[PDB]
Structure formats: structure tokens, C-alpha cells
């Protein structure tokens, strides 16, 4: 019952949705609309399956992009340190096998067996990626099937089966330019396809200005962390809840 | 025979353990933690070993001791059991005994003298107490060895206890029953059996190479992987790999140098005489000079750190690296590397995985061995592209992520940069914007702490200033002192800022936002050097004097009284109308200010304050009889 009510404490207060995203790491300021994003994507959809067969999707797909002031790393800190289960890895050091499935010999035997890449791990999780329009094409390609699908399709060496994927990416990444270029639009700063575009739910672009009554305020607290609602614990005990309803 | 004495030792030990003292320091040492120890629950000691050559008998027990050392400690080990219980009982100051006496303790010196160092011992050397000092690099995992047999007879169940002495194993002829006697009948149960834990660490030694150490039982698992170590154990090599049986591992100048670290706090001329000692053949550069100084230095550690970096776009014939060539020598020991000599591997690591270890291992890069310390990068400009995506997270968490076929980690790579890099093109191109002349994307320009803009004119004046310098150089504070003094600063100051230090800083930074490329990260350097020049004033708390003038350094060292607001550009040259106007005004309130006070004249000083919130100006008054 004292479990019971600690945990009905964060779902039944008329306020609670108000009160999450202001618990999404504290640390940094402002941003506001990440960090209902990333809860919503904290909390994945209804995975459903057709009386045809065919199964639908219920894991969110999240990318954030920045100036290189602008602190996106740190949500994805926050996010590999507090999720469940999650994984953190960069752009320039992943690699097409390392994120999705690793063809490896095996022991005690001649034949070939898979090794858990980024991607199976933390499976039913989220995965994040920083400094995202770093990635080659040719690597960023195979993460497709499984922002979609939710599933890995191999046929190397052997190998024929279909991996279990549920996995929500979060990724983070710079306009081509390093800076915003404010003279343009929204359709030419960002090197990214349309098939990548499409797949992410949410999609963020954060800028920076010159506002005097915003940078003493950032500039105010920030240095508060060099001198130094909801807690974090909390978090994880009401979603181990709230992911069992099913509207 | 043997140099110890069972009688003789235990008692010259006895009066050491009962009078030592280090010369309120008066007081007797072991005196208060015999007290301590009996307190404790803890199974061994870990004996002050520096008492031994700060007691004269004991420096002889320690040469007698150095062929001998496992024999001592038994002996000790029942001497503190017999100390517990003379404590416990017969003092009956307790009665909590019946644990103590039935187990055992070890004891265990940690700062024995250290030997002639490694590769300087000799086959007779080995068996004897060594002291050595290095760094771990890798752990294997525990591995149980035998200690106590458990045998069963096969035929009728009976069960004996044996024990191995020396290293054998003693397999049973019979079954020990007066009735049941086949012989070879008693079977060994794996499983029933008692192990001790056994661990291999690996250390990289620098004698007073890499070595593989040894631990056993509590030992292991202690050291693990990049801890700084010293090594108090036996140098060992038996039918031959070299090898020490560690005993004790620690994990980590006089009071003259007090006083002559506190002459130079004390003087006035602290920076400028830094900078005019810091290095006797580069000529000026104060800015320089305080620049990589307060690198040095370093900002605090809190969990945010100190690791200030530095970028020189000086013009390509400015002395700079033999300022980073000195730099390398001058500072604790770090790594000297050049961006174009260098890979991502060749920085970060290779990392793979062991069949015997059965975990990942890592084969540090440049800029991993550089951890905790300092770090110098020639040739930035011409790093690789993958190189420089490394750098992106070093510079904002100090860790590095893989994430490959296989391996998925994280690494620390905690240490400070030192960039030198040529301007774009043959020469420094101030017809161009500073931003155009630097080949560094934004993101990774602004992430830099300082920027220095190191220029070369060509002025007559100015080149016989710099030639007589050095023309008479190479003719015919020591580094002692200055290694002494900044190992002091790093130890004992953690300056925290204070209020009214932290209030100005919102303006500072503000004035360079509205004149926007004003990031954030120079916001980190309007701390980070702050606390860098109170280190160096040794103040504990960071004032408001050394926020303002590391506000200046950054102006300075970046030169923006000398740039273009709007596109830029540099001014070459850095009597004017506004300067006659601003005169004009000034002289004009003076020759008011000087006569509406209730006299006819007034200080200096007082004058100055009164309109400053000036001599040129009064000078020629004077000149003119005003
Ligand atoms: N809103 C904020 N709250 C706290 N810190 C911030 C905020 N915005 C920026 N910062 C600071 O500025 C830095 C920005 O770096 P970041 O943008 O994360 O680099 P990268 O582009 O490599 O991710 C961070 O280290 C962070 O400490
Ligand atoms: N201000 C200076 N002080 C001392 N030596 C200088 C100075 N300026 C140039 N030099 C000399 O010019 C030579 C050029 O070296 P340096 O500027 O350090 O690297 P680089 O050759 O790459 O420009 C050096 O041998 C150095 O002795
Ligand atoms: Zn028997």
C-alpha cells in the first residue's frame, strides 16, 4: 500500500503532466520542448498487431539539432543515465555492425553466431547517438529497419534469422554550416534525406540569439553550476507504471 | 643461516613499538594506536614503514631484514595476536577475544626505503624486500588456488582434511579406518574444497618498464585499472619471468621552501617577474607568458573541470615551438605530440578483447597518457578530420565513447591542450576576417578557452629591441624552484569564487554578446581562468581583481580593441580629433573640479577618483600656469 500510494502520488495530481517535463534533466536550462519530447519518447506507444498479421510500431524516434552552444550532449547523458536500459555511443566512432548485429565465429563449433550490437542492446529501451550529421550514409542506413520494424534482417555467412529491435533512438546533431545559417531556411541548414526526416516523430531545431534578458539569466545560472518537483527516482518507479496502460 | 633472530627481532621491535617518536609532534606513535588497533576489526596492519629509517635500530633491522622478510612478519603476525590478547585480557582493559585469537593477521610496512631500482638488481637481489613505483594498467580476474584438500574414500565414506604445505599435493595411500584399509581408495571432491583468491595486475614500473605484479587474498581486486601505485613487495624470479610478490601497495621538501615560495607570493613583482623567468629566451609576450602559465596553473576540479586549452594563430615565424618544446620539459612529465603525426588511434587507444583475461584491454593512445596532466599539439591545423571529431567530446566531458564491432565503452582521457596552428596561407591576413584566417570549424573554435593572436611587424625599433636580446644571450627562478612552486599551488589551493566576483561576470559577458560569435564556452573560460590566477595568487577564494584581468587576457588575447566590429578585420596600427575632445573635456571640468571645492587647490589622487568614477592633462595646465 505505502508502494501503492507513493506511486499513485504521480499519477493521480491533476498537474502531473506539467510537473514531468520540469523533472527531465534539471541541470540544463531552458529548452523546454526536449524535454517533453524525450518524456513522451520515455514512454513509447501501444505496439499492435493486425487481425492481418501485419504488426505496428509503438517506439518513438527523436532527433535534436543545434548550435554547438546550444547543450544537446548533456540531454543525452542525462538520458543513458537515468533510462532503464540505454545506450550511449558517438557519431565518427559507431559503425554499421557495432550498432546493429555483429557477425562473430563461434566457440566450440564452426559455425558463425550474432553478438549483440548497440542496437540489441538495450532493447525495449532507448538508444541514443551524439553528433548524428556525422555519421557516414553508408552506416546511417542500417539503422533504418529498426526505427521502423523494430527488427534486424540478416543473411551473412549462415546467418538467416530476424533479431528483435524495439529500440527508441534519440540522436543529437549540428546544421552542415557549424552555425545556423539564419539567412536560409529550415530546408537547406540540414544535410539530412527525407527518408531519415520522415522516420523521427519529433524533430527539433533550437537556436540561439543575442536576447540580453535570456543570456543573464542563462549566464546567471550556469555559472551556478560551477558553484554550486518529482526526483529522479521517482521517474523510473511511475513509468515502470505508466507503461503498462493501453488506450 | 638467517639474519633474524626469532628472540632478538621481536624484541628490538618491542622497544621500537613502545618509544618511537618522530624526533604536538612529542607524542609517542604507536603508543596511541596500539588503543586504536585493538579497537579496530580489521584482520592486518599496515605499519608506518617510514618510522623504520626515522629510528636508528630499525634502518639496521631493515639491511638485516632485506634478505629476510617473510620470517619477521610471521613472527608479527602472532606478536599482534599476542598483542591483542595482552591487550584484551591481561591489561583487561577488554574481553572481546574469542574471534581474534582463533583467526590470523598479517602485517604489512608501506614505506620501506626504496631500492637501486629495477633493472639495476641482480640474481642475488632476487627474493629481497624491494620498493617500487609505476602505474596499473591491467587486472585479470580472480583465480582460485588450492590451499586445503577435501578426500572421501570411495568405499566407505570417510572423509580427511588435508592441507597443502609448500606447494604439494600429499594423495593418500589408505583409508585412515582401522577396518575399511583399501588402499588408493580416497578420491578428491573438487568442490569440497577451500580456495584463496589470486589475481595478476599489470604495472607499468619506473624505476627509482612494465612488470606483472601478483596479489593474493584481500590484495586483489584493490588496484584496478589507471591507478597511480607504489609497490612495496619482493622482486621475484624463480625456475625466471620477472615478477613481484607485492606485500603492500599505496595507492597515490621543507619548511625552507615554505619560506621561499612565501618571498615570491609576497613580492609585488609575482607576474612580472613569472614572466621574466618563466622563459629567458622568448623576449616579452607579458599576455603569453600569463597565457600558458595559467594553463599550468589549471582552474578547479568539481563534480567541471580546470583543463584550460590554447590555441597561438601567431604569424609562422614567431617562437612558439621552442616555447612548446620547453613547455614539455618544464611541466610535470606529459606527452609531446603533433597533430599531423597523429591518428585517432594514435591519440585515443586500440582496444580489443583476451581470450586468457576474458575482458577488454587497452593499448593507450597519446592523448589517454596524458591523463590528469598536460598535453602539447603541434601541427592543430593540420589534424586529421576523424582526429579532430575525437576532440568534440574530449573537450566538453574529457571521456571517450566506442561503440564498434565487439566493443562498447566508454573511456577518460582528462588532461589539458596546448594548439599551436600556422594562420591559413603563407602569413597571417589581416585583410580578412580572424574567423577566415583560422582553418577550425566554429564548433570546434569556440570551444577553446584562449586564443592568442601573435603577430610579427616589421619595425626597426622594435627589431633591435628583440636582436639585442638574444644577440648576447649565447654568449660565453631556477625550474626547481618554478616546478616546486606550481606543484605547491596545485596541492593546496581550491580557490571558490566569491559574490561580488560572480555579479561582475554578468556584465563581462553580456558587453561581448551584444558586439556579436559570444558562445557559452567562452562563458567556461570566465571561470575556469579565474580560478586559475587565484591558484597562482595562492589566495583560497578568487577576487574580483583576478576575474577582471582574466576578462583582459581574453580581450587581449584575442584582440578585440584591434578588431573590426563589423566585418572583423584587424587594425594595422594597433593625435586624433577625439582625443583632443576628450582632452578638451577633461581640462574644461578640471579647471572647475580644482577651484568649486572650498579650496585653491587639492590632491591628485583625490581629484583623479572624483572624475575618473588626467596628468597629461594638468601638465600642460601647469605649462600654461592654470
Ligand atoms: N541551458 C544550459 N544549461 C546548462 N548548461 C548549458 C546550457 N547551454 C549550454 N550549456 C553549457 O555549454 C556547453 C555546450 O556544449 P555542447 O553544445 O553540449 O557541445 P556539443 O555540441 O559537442 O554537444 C555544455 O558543456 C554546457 O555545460
Ligand atoms: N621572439 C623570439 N624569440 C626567440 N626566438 C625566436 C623568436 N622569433 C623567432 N625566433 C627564432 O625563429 C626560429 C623559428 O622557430 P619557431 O618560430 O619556434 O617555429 P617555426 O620555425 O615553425 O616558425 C626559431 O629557431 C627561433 O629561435
Ligand atoms: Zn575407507
Redesign the pocket.
Given at each position: 500500500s505505502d508502494e501503492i500510494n507513493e506511486l499513485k502520488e504521480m499519477v493521480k495530481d491533476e498537474h502531473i503532466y506539467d510537473k514531468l517535463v520540469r523533472s527531465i534533466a534539471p541541470a540544463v536550462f531552458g529548452h523546454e520542448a526536449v524535454k517533453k519530447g524525450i518524456l513522451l519518447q520515455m514512454l513509447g506507444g501501444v505496439h499492435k498487431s493486425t487481425v492481418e498479421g501485419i504488426k505496428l510500431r509503438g517506439d518513438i524516434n527523436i532527433c535534436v539539432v543545434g548550435d554547438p552552444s546550444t547543450s544537446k550532449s548533456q540531454f543525452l547523458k542525462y538520458v543513458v543515465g537515468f533510462a532503464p536500459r540505454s545506450v550511449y555511443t558517438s557519431g565518427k566512432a559507431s559503425s554499421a555492425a557495432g550498432l546493429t548485429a555483429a557477425v562473430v565465429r563461434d566457440e566450440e563449433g564452426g559455425d558463425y553466431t550474432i553478438e549483440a550490437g548497440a542496437l540489441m542492446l538495450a532493447d525495449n529501451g532507448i538508444c541514443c547517438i551524439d553528433e548524428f550529421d556525422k555519421m557516414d550514409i553508408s552506416d546511417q542506413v542500417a539503422i533504418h529497419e529498426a526505427m521502423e520494424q523494430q527488427t534486424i534482417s540478416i543473411a551473412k555467412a549462415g546467418i538467416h534469422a530476424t533479431l528483435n529491435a524495439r529500440t527508441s533512438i534519440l540522436a543529437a546533431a549540428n546544421p552542415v554550416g557549424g552555425r545556423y545559417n539564419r539567412k536560409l531556411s529550415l530546408r537547406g541548414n540540414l544535410n539530412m534525406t527525407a527518408p531519415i526526416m520522415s522516420r523521427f516523430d519529433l524533430f527539433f531545431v533550437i537556436l540561439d540569439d543575442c536576447n540580453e534578458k535570456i543570456d543573464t539569466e542563462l549566464a546567471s545560472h550556469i555559472v551556478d553550476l560551477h558553484m554550486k518537483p518529482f526526483s529522479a527516482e521517482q521517474l523510473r518507479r511511475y513509468i515502470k507504471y505508466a507503461r503498462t496502460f493501453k488506450p | 643461516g638467517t639474519n633474524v633472530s626469532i628472540q632478538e627481532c621481536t624484541t628490538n621491535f618491542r622497544n621500537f613499538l613502545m618509544s618511537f617518536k618522530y624526533k604536538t609532534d612529542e607524542e609517542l606513535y604507536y603508543i596511541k594506536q596500539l588503543n586504536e588497533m585493538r579497537e579496530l576489526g580489521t584482520s592486518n596492519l599496515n605499519l608506518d614503514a617510514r618510522n623504520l629509517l626515522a629510528y636508528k635500530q630499525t634502518e639496521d633491522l631493515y639491511h638485516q631484514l632485506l634478505n629476510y622478510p617473510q620470517e619477521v612478519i610471521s613472527i608479527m603476525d602472532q606478536t599482534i595476536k599476542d598483542c591483542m590478547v595482552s591487550l584484551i585480557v591481561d591489561n583487561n582493559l577488554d574481553y572481546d577475544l574469542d574471534e581474534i585469537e582463533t583467526k590470523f593477521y598479517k602485517v604489512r610496512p608501506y614505506n620501506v626505503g626504496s631500492c637501486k631500482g629495477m633493472r639495476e638488481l641482480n640474481p642475488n637481489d632476487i627474493d629481497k624486500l624491494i620498493n617500487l613505483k609505476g602505474l596499473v594498467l591491467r587486472s585479470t580476474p580472480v583465480i582460485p588456488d588450492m590451499k586445503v584438500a577435501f578426500f572421501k574414500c570411495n568405499v566407505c565414506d570417510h572423509t580427511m582434511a588435508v592441507e597443502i604445505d609448500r606447494g604439494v599435493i600429499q594423495e593418500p595411500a589408505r583409508c585412515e579406518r582401522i577396518d575399511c584399509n583399501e588402499p588408493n581408495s580416497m578420491s578428491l571432491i573438487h568442490n569440497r574444497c577451500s580456495f584463496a583468491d589470486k589475481q595478476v595486475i599489470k604495472l607499468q614500473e619506473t624505476p627509482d618498464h612494465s612488470i606483472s605484479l601478483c596479489v593474493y587474498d584481500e590484495l586483489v581486486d584493490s588496484c584496478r585499472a589507471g591507478d597511480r601505485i607504489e609497490v612495496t613487495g619482493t622482486f621475484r624470479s624463480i625456475p625466471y619471468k620477472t615478477y613481484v610478490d607485492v606485500v603492500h601497495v599505496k595507492k597515490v621538501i621543507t619548511d625552507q621552501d615554505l619560506a621561499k615560495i612565501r618571498e615570491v607570493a609576497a613580492r609585488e613583482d609575482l607576474y612580472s617577474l613569472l614572466a621574466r623567468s618563466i622563459a629567458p629566451?622568448?623576449?616579452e609576450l607579458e599576455d603569453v607568458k600569463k597565457g600558458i602559465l595559467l594553463q599550468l596553473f589549471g582552474g578547479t576540479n568539481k563534480t567541471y573541470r580546470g583543463d584550460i586549452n590554447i590555441l597561438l594563430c601567431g604569424d609562422?615565424?614567431?617562437?612558439?615551438?621552442?616555447i612548446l618544446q620547453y613547455v614539455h620539459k618544464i611541466t610535470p612529465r606529459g606527452v609531446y605530440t603533433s597533430g599531423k603525426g597523429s591518428s585517432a588511434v594514435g591519440l585515443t587507444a586500440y582496444i580489443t578483447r583476451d581470450v586468457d583475461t576474458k575482458q577488454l584491454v587497452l593499448e593507450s593512445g597519446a592523448l589517454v597518457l596524458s591523463d590528469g596532466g598536460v598535453c602539447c599539439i603541434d601541427e592543430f591545423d593540420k589534424m586529421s578530420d576523424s582526429t579532430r571529431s575525437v576532440l568534440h567530446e574530449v573537450m566538453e566531458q574529457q571521456t571517450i565513447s566506442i561503440a564498434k564491432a565487439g566493443i562498447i565503452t566508454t573511456l577518460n582521457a582528462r588532461s589539458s591542450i596546448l594548439a599551436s596552428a600556422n594562420p591559413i596561407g603563407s602569413r597571417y591576413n589581416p585583410n580578412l576576417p580572424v574567423t577566415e584566417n583560422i582553418d577550425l570549424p566554429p564548433p570546434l573554435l569556440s570551444r577553446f578557452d584562449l586564443v592568442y593572436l601573435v603577430l610579427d611587424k616589421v619595425d626597426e625599433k622594435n627589431d633591435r629591441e628583440?636582436a639585442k636580446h638574444?644577440t648576447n644571450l649565447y654568449l660565453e627562478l631556477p625550474v626547481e624552484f618554478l616546478t616546486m612552486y606550481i606543484s605547491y599551488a596545485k596541492e593546496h589551493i581550491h580557490p571558490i569564487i566569491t559574490e561580488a566576483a560572480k555579479t561582475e561576470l554578468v556584465r563581462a559577458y553580456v558587453g561581448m554578446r551584444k558586439m556579436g560569435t559570444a558562445t557559452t564556452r567562452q562563458l567556461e573560460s570566465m571561470i575556469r581562468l579565474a580560478e586559475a590566477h587565484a591558484k597562482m595568487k595562492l589566495k583560497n577564494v578568487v577576487e574580483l581583481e583576478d576575474v577582471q584581468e582574466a576578462v583582459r587576457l581574453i580581450r587581449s588575447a584575442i584582440k578585440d580593441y584591434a578588431t573590426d566590429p563589423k566585418t572583423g578585420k584587424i587594425d594595422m596600427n594597433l593625435k586624433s580629433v577625439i582625443q583632443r575632445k576628450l582632452q578638451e573635456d577633461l581640462s574644461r571640468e578640471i579647471m572647475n573640479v580644482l577651484k568649486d571645492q572650498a579650496s585653491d587647490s587639492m590632491s591628485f589622487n583625490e581629484l583623479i577618483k572624483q572624475i575618473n568614477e588626467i596628468q597629461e592633462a594638468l601638465s600642460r595646465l601647469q605649462q600654461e600656469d592654470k
Open positions: - | 629566451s622568448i623576449y609562422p615565424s614567431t617562437s612558439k615551438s621552442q628583440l638574444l
